[PDB]
């Protein structure tokens, strides 16, 4: 699959992260990210996708070595970590045709796994609106503990 790039944006307290909500198949909440274009550098794709989805330009803030990368079903997703962005920042996507809403979420309240259905003796996982963000949460919390305190 084609690699994806984006950002995990945190506020100044390091408490909260910015998630975006799409439509249809992308109807839940997830980090801003998207597919890399031909010959485009990872940092440029991340900034591009983040600016298209949030209206916020991370180019002056990206640190090259500060990201979380996950390979999920053979697609690689790398989110650059961008702390310190004020919570009163005005985010607006380029078009409401792709992005429904943009919100801050408390990191400590976000799930870092989906719940099974053991109550009902049924296999699998219950739906969770944070399903695209979930795989990054534990690695983010571990990364913040290491790199900050
Ligand atoms: O990325 C997602 N959500 C946030 C988002 C990011 C960019 C955007 F333009 C709109 C919403 C998402 C949700 N479900 N799927 C995805 C991606 C691929 C697998 C299905």
What are the distances in angstroms from CA 31 to CA 25, 57, 109, 119, 120?
15, 15, 16, 30, 31
Q: Are 47 and 58 within 8 A, CB to CB?
A: yes
Q: What Å resolution does this PDB entry report?
A: 1.8
Check if 24 has its Cβ closer than 6 Å to any atom of ligand 1. Answer: no
CA-proximal residue: ligand 1, atom 17 (nearest): 26
**What is the DSSP track for 43-70?**
HHHHHHHHHHHHS---TTT--TT-EEEE
Method: X-ray
Structure tokens at 140: 């983010």
Burial of 16 (0-12, 13-18, 19+ CB in 10 A): buried
Q: Does domain 1-149 have CATH number 3.90.79.10?
A: yes
- β-pairing, 75-82 vs 4-9, is parallel
Q: Whose CA is nearest to atom 14 of ligand 1?
A: 26
Give the E-state strand segments of the chain in sequence order: 4-9, 16-21, 29-30, 33-35, 67-72, 75-82, 101-106, 116-117, 122-125
């Amino acid at each position: 699959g084609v690699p994806t790039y984006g950002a995990i944006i945190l506020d100044e307290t390091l408490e909260n992260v910015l998630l975006v909500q799409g439509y249809l198949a992308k109807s839940g909440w997830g980090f801003p990210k998207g597919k890399v274009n031909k010959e485009e550098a990872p940092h440029d794709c991340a900034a591009r996708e983040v600016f298209e989805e949030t209206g916020f330009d991370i180019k002056d803030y990206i640190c090259k070595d500060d990201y979380i990368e996950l390979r999920i079903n053979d697609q690689l997703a790398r989110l650059y970590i961008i702390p310190g962005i004020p919570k009163d920042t005005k985010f607006n996507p380029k078009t409401r045709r792709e992005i429904r809403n943009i919100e801050w979420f408390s990191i400590e309240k976000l799930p870092c796994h989906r719940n099974d259905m053991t109550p009902k003796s049924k296999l699998g996982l219950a739906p969770n609106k944070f399903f695209m963000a979930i795989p990054f949460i534990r690695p983010l919390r571990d990364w913040l503990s290491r790199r900050f305190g």
